[PDB]
A paper describes a structure:
10-Formyltetrahydrofolate dehydrogenase (FDH), which is composed of a small N-terminal domain (Nt-FDH) and a large C-terminal domain, is an abundant folate enzyme in the liver and converts 10-formyltetrahydrofolate (10-FTHF) to tetrahydrofolate (THF) and CO2. Nt-FDH alone possesses a hydrolase activity, which converts 10-FTHF to THF and formate in the presence of β-mercaptoethanol. The N-terminal hydrolase domain of FDH (Nt-FDH) binds folate and is homologous to glycinamide ribonucleotide formyltransferase (GART) and methionyl-tRNA formyltransferase (FMT), enzymes that are crucial for de novo purine biosynthesis and translation initiation, respectively. In this study, we determined crystal structures of zebrafish wild-type apo Nt-FDH (zNt-FDH) and its ternary complexes with the substrate 10-formyl-5,8-dideazafolate (10-FDDF) and the products tetrahydrofolate (THF) and formate.
In the active site, the formyl group of the substrate is converted into the product formate during catalysis. In the structure of the formate complex, the formate molecule interacts with His106 and Asp142. The O1 atom of formate is directly hydrogen-bonded to OD2 of Asp142 (within 2.73 Å). The O1 atom of the formate interacts with the ND1 atom of His106 and the OD1 atom of Asp142 at distances of 3.46 and 3.19 Å, respectively. A hypothesis has been proposed in which β-mercaptoethanol is required for replacing and releasing the product from the catalytic site because of the structural similarity between β-mercaptoethanol and the product formate.
Numbering used by the authors: 1 to 308
Write the structure that this text describes.
């Protein structure tokens, strides 16, 4: 069938490629502008294939849909919109335009974790199960009826990147293809999302990913891994903002106290720079180990080398 892809990133690129190779006519690709030496991966791939590529900075202005962008969208005549990681607000005029409406990939077990940082909050809350949902867009925020869903186990030391790469990305592409297949054969369902279990969490930016040290080590570990790599959990250390990556909870080594004491403002207790990384303490006195640190200038550095 005729499909418009509205999204961005590698995931968008992969969904576009698999849908095209399934035999679907991609009539248009709607993604983000270059910024600015960098073209979005979905834009690159579609352009290679001679598919119309649109780079709208925005779809609406002062709450109202922008007519130019809506008409340009409608010109390609999609019978279905597919939205893999759309970071822009898409007007319901576009959403409802095609024959089959629009479907959206969302990396949580809806109705849990509605909102654009679902993966982060899956880990921040320490969920044991995670996964993705493909759902039909309605006017709400990730509230639309479910087409399909897929589950995976969350690992104790999963960060955003690892759960994404192990399951959410590759199984997500497969799930998007299967969903379009179900729509094409005419048997895709619409399961109204249940009320119970529904949550929303805020979008994770640098501005709101600052570490609260007054928590158990397990909560701090979850916060750090739940923002690793993006946007990066951070705290102040000796004057400057430092991001923490590659966390794991520890057991019983004592501690080995062979490490070098590192004062961290607000921390329950001074940290330890050890040969294996930065040992941090929660308010329960329990430890986590951070592998890497990054400073204001994106300079990444192993935790073990803070002083060295």
């Amino acid at each position: 069938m005729k499909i418009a892809v509205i999204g961005q990133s590698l995931f968008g690129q992969e969904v576009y490629k698999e849908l095209k190779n399934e035999g679907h006519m991609i009539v248009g690709v709607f993604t983000i502008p270059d910024k600015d030496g960098k073209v979005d991966p979905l834009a690159i791939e579609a352009e290679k294939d001679g598919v119309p590529v649109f780079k709208f900075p925005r779809w609406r202005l002062k709450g109202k849909a922008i007519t130019e962008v809506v008409d340009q969208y409608k010109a390609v005549g999609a019978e279905l919109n597919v939205l893999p990681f759309c970071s822009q607000f898409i007007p319901m005029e576009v959403i409802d335009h095609p024959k089959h409406g629009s479907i959206i990939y969302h990396p949580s077990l809806l109705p849990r974790h509605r909102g654009a940082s679902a993966i982060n909050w899956t880990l921040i809350h320490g969920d044991k199960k995670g996964g993705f949902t493909v759902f039909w867009a309605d006017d709400g925020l990730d509230t639309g009826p479910i087409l399909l869903q897929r589950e995976c186990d969350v690992e104790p030391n999963d960060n955003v990147n690892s759960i994404y790469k192990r399951f959410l990305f590759p199984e997500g592409v497969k799930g998007m293809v299967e969903a379009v297949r179900l729509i094409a054969t005419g048997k895709a369902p619409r399961i109204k999302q249940p009320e119970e279990g529904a949550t929303y969490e805020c979008i994770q930016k640098k501005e709101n990913s600052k570490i609260d040290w007054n928590q158990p080590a397990e909560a701090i570990h979850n916060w750090i891994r739940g923002n690793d790599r993006v946007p990066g959990a951070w705290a102040e250390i000796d004057g400057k903002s430092v991001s923490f990556y590659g966390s794991t909870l520890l057991e019983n080594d004592h501690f080995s106290s062979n490490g070098q004491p590192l004062e961290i403002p607000g921390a329950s207790r001074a940290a330890l720079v050890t040969k294996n990384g930065l040992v941090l303490f929660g308010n329960d006195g329990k430890m986590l180990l951070v592998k890497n640190l990054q400073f204001e200038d994106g300079k990444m550095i192993p935790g073990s080398q803070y002083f060295k």
